[PDB]
Design a protein around this ligand. Sequence first.
Ligand SMILES: [K+]
Ligand code: NA
Length: 411
Amino acid sequence: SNAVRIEITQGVDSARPIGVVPFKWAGPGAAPEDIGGIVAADLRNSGKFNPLDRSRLPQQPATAQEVQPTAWSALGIDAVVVGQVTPNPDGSYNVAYQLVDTGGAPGTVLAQNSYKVNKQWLRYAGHTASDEVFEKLTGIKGAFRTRIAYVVQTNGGQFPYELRVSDYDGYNQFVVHRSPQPLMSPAWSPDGSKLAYVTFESGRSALVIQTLANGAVRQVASFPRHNGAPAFSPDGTKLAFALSKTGSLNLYVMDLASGQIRQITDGRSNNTEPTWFPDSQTLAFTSDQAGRPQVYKMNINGGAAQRITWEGSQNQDADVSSDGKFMVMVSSNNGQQHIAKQDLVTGGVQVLSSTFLDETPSLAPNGTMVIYSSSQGMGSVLNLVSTDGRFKARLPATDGQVKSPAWSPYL
Ligand SMILES: [K+]
Ligand code: NA
């Protein structure tokens, strides 16, 4: 199934032109998929390419040698993707692509690969070709094999809330957990094998970690009042989260090997929404110690908290990039609530989104794209915005109200 579907609302008119030719299907009858279409959709979804419309291709070469570079260079296109899909006698498929230069080294094969995959993984093969083309031309690792987690409120009676996972483009959706009560704040382990989330099934909040492959569930915390806002450390050793049992929200860290929980804040201010820096020892977090929520930074091993958001009436729910050079967050000014980016090297802030009641932003693992949600009151949709603010897309769920996204790590 694929309930979440990307609808581009603001394309990048000047994005790098590229030719993506339909792949040559070697079997009988109709091709099982349209791999060239997946590659073009992935490169367009990144906000960094403008694949030529299939109806305007100057030729449809089935091999690298058939590419006529002058036909593409004449259109301002300096690279062309061609490919082949062949059924194997064992019932599997070989999905091959070649990236051909049509610029300064016309006809040269810049990159190529061939993937032996079972039917279930044909989309994954297409995404692998996209990832290689994207990285070969931009020097940035591709995110097309990644997944998203999100919560859908269906129209159903007994278990209306569903924590789900899908590919980043909505395909291959599956249900992680269904509940009569709201599910909130999913967070990925860095190896992509587990999701921490908050459940209200007992009637009050409980933080749990579910292993996706086998559905195993580990209880973390169910103390009185609020338990939530989980974040896994990048090194795989710790889970940070917030508990308000002390009359005020404090940050806690659980050592995943021992299950031991340590309290790392114990002041009067509410401290919540932890997000890790790449070192697995520094956290950004939300605090009300300056009145309206702002984002602070602290080392889990001791030392004072440092305020880092000095611009704007209110800032919260941060997500620090995988490289630690910037973060995205929810910035509120003049009654407007939008996704913003703060450069942690230059200190500057840029508002990225223009939708209504924007919340819970999550960065793709290459730092190029943000997934977030926008509340409609009763309803909700997901949205995408590039970290440079030029690309925008909306991500509604066909079967319900969707919110609380989290972008997976590289898979
Ligand atoms: K506190
Ligand atoms: Na992050």
